[PDB]
Amino acid sequence: SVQIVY
Amino acid sequence: SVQIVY
């Protein structure tokens, strides 16, 4: 997965 | 999955 959190 | 949170 690609998991991005800002 | 692609999981993005702002």
Add this chain to the structure above:
Amino acid sequence: SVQIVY
């Protein structure tokens, strides 16, 4: 899935 939260 693509899961996006703003």
Add this chain to the structure above:
Amino acid sequence: SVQIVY
């Protein structure tokens, strides 16, 4: 699924 929340 595509799950988007604003």
Add this chain to the structure above:
Amino acid sequence: SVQIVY
């Protein structure tokens, strides 16, 4: 499904 919430 496509699930979008504003």
Add this chain to the structure above:
Amino acid sequence: SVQIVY
């Protein structure tokens, strides 16, 4: 899929 938004 399940989407729950508060």
Add this chain to the structure above:
Amino acid sequence: SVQIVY
């Protein structure tokens, strides 16, 4: 699918 919005 299930979508619940409050």
Add this chain to the structure above:
Amino acid sequence: SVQIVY
């Protein structure tokens, strides 16, 4: 998939 947003 499951998406829960508070």
Add this chain to the structure above:
Amino acid sequence: SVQIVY
């Protein structure tokens, strides 16, 4: 996938 955002 699971996405939980507070």
Add this chain to the structure above:
Amino acid sequence: SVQIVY
């Protein structure tokens, strides 16, 4: 995948 954001 699991993504949890506080």
